[PDB]
Design an enzyme around this catalytic site. Structure first.
Site, PDB file in Angstrom:
ATOM      1  N   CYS A 160       0.828  -1.194   0.000  1.00 56.29           N
ATOM      2  CA  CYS A 160       0.000   0.000   0.000  1.00 56.29           C
ATOM      3  C   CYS A 160       0.873   1.260   0.000  1.00 56.29           C
ATOM      4  O   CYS A 160       0.492   2.282  -0.588  1.00 56.29           O
ATOM      5  CB  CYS A 160      -0.989  -0.041   1.185  1.00 56.29           C
ATOM      6  SG  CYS A 160      -1.968  -1.611   1.374  1.00 56.29           S
ATOM      7  N   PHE A 211     -10.766  -4.816   0.176  1.00 55.27           N
ATOM      8  CA  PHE A 211      -9.927  -4.413  -0.948  1.00 55.27           C
ATOM      9  C   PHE A 211     -10.760  -4.169  -2.189  1.00 55.27           C
ATOM     10  O   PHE A 211     -11.688  -4.931  -2.464  1.00 55.27           O
ATOM     11  CB  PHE A 211      -8.900  -5.506  -1.256  1.00 55.27           C
ATOM     12  CG  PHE A 211      -7.636  -5.413  -0.444  1.00 55.27           C
ATOM     13  CD1 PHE A 211      -7.521  -4.520   0.618  1.00 55.27           C
ATOM     14  CD2 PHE A 211      -6.570  -6.228  -0.720  1.00 55.27           C
ATOM     15  CE1 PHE A 211      -6.351  -4.428   1.384  1.00 55.27           C
ATOM     16  CE2 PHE A 211      -5.384  -6.140   0.051  1.00 55.27           C
ATOM     17  CZ  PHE A 211      -5.285  -5.231   1.104  1.00 55.27           C
ATOM     18  N   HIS A 299      -3.264   7.505   3.365  1.00 53.98           N
ATOM     19  CA  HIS A 299      -3.694   6.262   2.778  1.00 53.98           C
ATOM     20  C   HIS A 299      -4.517   5.619   3.872  1.00 53.98           C
ATOM     21  O   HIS A 299      -4.035   5.532   4.987  1.00 53.98           O
ATOM     22  CB  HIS A 299      -2.525   5.368   2.448  1.00 53.98           C
ATOM     23  CG  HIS A 299      -2.909   3.930   2.302  1.00 53.98           C
ATOM     24  ND1 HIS A 299      -3.642   3.456   1.234  1.00 53.98           N
ATOM     25  CD2 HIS A 299      -2.667   2.858   3.096  1.00 53.98           C
ATOM     26  CE1 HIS A 299      -3.827   2.156   1.372  1.00 53.98           C
ATOM     27  NE2 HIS A 299      -3.244   1.767   2.493  1.00 53.98           N
ATOM     28  N   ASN A 332     -10.061  -0.055  -0.009  1.00 57.73           N
ATOM     29  CA  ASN A 332      -8.623   0.042  -0.014  1.00 57.73           C
ATOM     30  C   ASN A 332      -8.125  -0.417  -1.390  1.00 57.73           C
ATOM     31  O   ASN A 332      -8.168  -1.613  -1.726  1.00 57.73           O
ATOM     32  CB  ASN A 332      -8.117  -0.875   1.091  1.00 57.73           C
ATOM     33  CG  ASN A 332      -6.637  -0.771   1.320  1.00 57.73           C
ATOM     34  OD1 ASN A 332      -5.864  -0.392   0.424  1.00 57.73           O
ATOM     35  ND2 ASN A 332      -6.214  -1.131   2.534  1.00 57.73           N
TER      36      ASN A 332
END
Lengths: 387, 389
Positions: A160, A211, A299, A332
């Site tokens: 990430c 995700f 993030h 994400n």
């Protein structure tokens, strides 16, 4: 020395344009438990499914976009097996699609930039997925029709935090080369980690709920052309550090069954509690004294993570509201996400009538985190908004 | 303001290569008896007309020696590794995740010891391998084994092929040049566990990679503005660039599947590489007004005997120019991205021993060359440094 002084840029690296893209398949979180358990043939696992439903509701995600469809799962059912060999089926897909999706974000960024492709000097491209030789950099350069002389760099299989790290690299390429215009691109597609549910591995379902897919692109360069290139941000400093003895906190393995990921329950605490050392090193030189003095392009990771960071730094809820929006609306998207957050921050700054593209503040931190534990801090200066 | 601070942050001079260390696995694989060992251990003894085709390949490669992590004992413990096209990925991953970083440690320790400064002064690490993909990466593992500071800025580059050894120089150039005090640990490590496999008759290509490929690692330290009297530059990086030859993605490449890595090539790959060097070499050597190709020195990724031969024959280089590439390829084989570091190490060592005036065999300018899938050409221009004896 004389050569050195001439061939180098003069001012700081600048983010000049931002583009984003996703696959075209909307997956709504409220019906995802139903889709996931039906198409992986797991309708006889009702107790696990009900548990899946609760987990989905708590992720706070509303929608994600995936390349995967029911059609693809029926055509290659090994993608559904949780621990049987499925690597080849996954490779067939990601080697093709990772560059295609990247193209979408690249084009949009290149369009906002408003300059001929022939003027791009470097491409820096990251993804977890799509390993082949030549690689995804090659394919993407080719789709876009970049000149053959473009310096290409592919960064595979970093997680990430790589989104932020690309800024760190782009900074040096842009600054050390007079005229350089760097195309930076993050694309992730969850096809290598998608898989059916296992009753003895309820926690690992967090990756099936959390995700999504997406690509983010930017054009970075020093010395903006006056009246042709309008910078959105200046990269003032970019750095990485590693948290001692936290390798087990989050990470994964690439095996015959694809990617499996792992995390400890304390990962939010681990991230939150170790941020302060980093941000100190980055922001003290500027004489900021409160974490609420700067803007935040975070993030997200997940909701708990945003939470634990918000609590530990004592941030007012506005700071990470952009991470939350993006996460809720897309999940994400690993390395790409931070570009979405970036994009969302500068647009909101314009719509809400703020004085800068960082919500009216001069200085910001763009923050990535991933396996290491790895922290990527990138310090931004905002740019004036003229309404 | 940030123009002001910009001046404070940036370095002044060119990036310099300050030290070079190299390492191999401890296991010697002589090429004269490799066909024997390679048929014995893959249970392919009851085949015989292929056995003679391969001995003939091993003879024409011109390789004498390679070092492999692999042993007979490991193949006993993990038989799937000898399978042609069966799933073997897990076994291969079990080794590379662990070993890639351990072999890179050795090369890096050597470079750092030549350099003779504390690890605390290393600010970046750029590390590449075809292999060893895990999260956290091989980059994290090497950093930890070396005891680098936690604040070291790391970059792992996985799964680019042979040209990556040269490409790292291209990146380290910018890291070193744009940061005052930057000291960049540059490492390349390759271990052929993912590509090793037994023979099939309906396949000649695979057979070549069992013959040509070896294991090893190289490491250099790159920094601008050397500390007077302490850091001794071996070369200055003057320029680094990348070029892709149009319509040539099929010339050389590979695929990562459940059986590991598979590598392909066209037979005319030597022609392809040599006929496309002129463009790169023009943009690189014309600014310096170089008359003859033989006026500069060469640190070329060998690739294989035919490739060296094509390059020398096309640029009409005298035998001395690529003799370092030949020597490395002969005594080690093709170690992918690491090879060119062994080549650089060889050139500067001989230059010393033979009494030369510079670290580039007596000459001022030289070009370091990488090639691999794309086709990708990596061109680094080197200025040599004086040898005071």
């Amino acid at each position: 020395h004389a050569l050195r002084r001439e061939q180098r840029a003069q001012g700081p690296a600048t983010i000049m344009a931002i583009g984003t893209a996703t696959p075209p398949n909307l997956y709504e979180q409220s019906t995802f438990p139903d889709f996931y358990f039906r198409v992986t043939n797991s309708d006889d696992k009702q107790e696990l499914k009900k548990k899946f439903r609760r987990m989905c509701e708590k992720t706070m995600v509303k929608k994600r976009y995936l390349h995967l469809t029911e059609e693809i799962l029926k055509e290659r059912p090994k993608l559904c097996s949780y621990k049987e060999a499925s690597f080849d089926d996954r490779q067939d897909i990601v080697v093709e699609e990772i560059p295609r999706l990247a193209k979408e974000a690249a084009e949009k960024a290149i369009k906002e930039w408003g300059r001929p492709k022939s003027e791009i000097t470097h491409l820096v491209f990251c993804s977890i997925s799509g390993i082949d030789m030549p690689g995804a950099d090659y394919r993407l350069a080719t789709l876009l029709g970049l000149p053959l002389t473009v310096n290409r760099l592919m960064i595979y299989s970093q997680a990430c935090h790589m989104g932020a790290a690309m800024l760190r690299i782009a900074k040096d390429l842009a600054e050390n080369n007079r005229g350089a215009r760097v195309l930076v691109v993050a694309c992730e597609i969850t096809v290598l980690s998608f898989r059916g549910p296992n009753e003895g591995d309820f926690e690992a379902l967090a990756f099936q709920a959390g995700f999504g897919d997406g690509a983010g692109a930017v054009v970075v360069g020093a010395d903006p052309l006056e009246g042709i290139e309008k910078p959105i941000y200046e990269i003032a400093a970019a750095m990485q550090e590693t948290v001692a003895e936290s390798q087990g906190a989050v990470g994964g393995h690439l095996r015959a069954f694809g990617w499996t990921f792992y995390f400890l329950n304390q990962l939010p605490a681990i991230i939150a509690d170790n941020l302060g050392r980093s941000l100190e090193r980055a922001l003290a030189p500027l004489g900021v004294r409160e974490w609420n003095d700067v803007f935040w392009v975070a993030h997200p990771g997940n909701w708990a993570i945003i939470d634990a960071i918000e609590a530990k730094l004592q941030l007012s809820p506005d700071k990470l509201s952009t991470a939350r929006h993006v996460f809720t609306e897309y999940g994400n998207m690993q390395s790409a996400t931070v570009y979405f957050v970036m994009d969302e921050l500068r647009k909101r700054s314009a719509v809400e009538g703020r004085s800068t593209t960082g919500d009216g503040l001069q200085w910001g931190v763009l923050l990535g985190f991933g396996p290491g534990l790895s922290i990527e801090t990138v310090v931004l200066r905002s740019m004036p908004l003229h309404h």
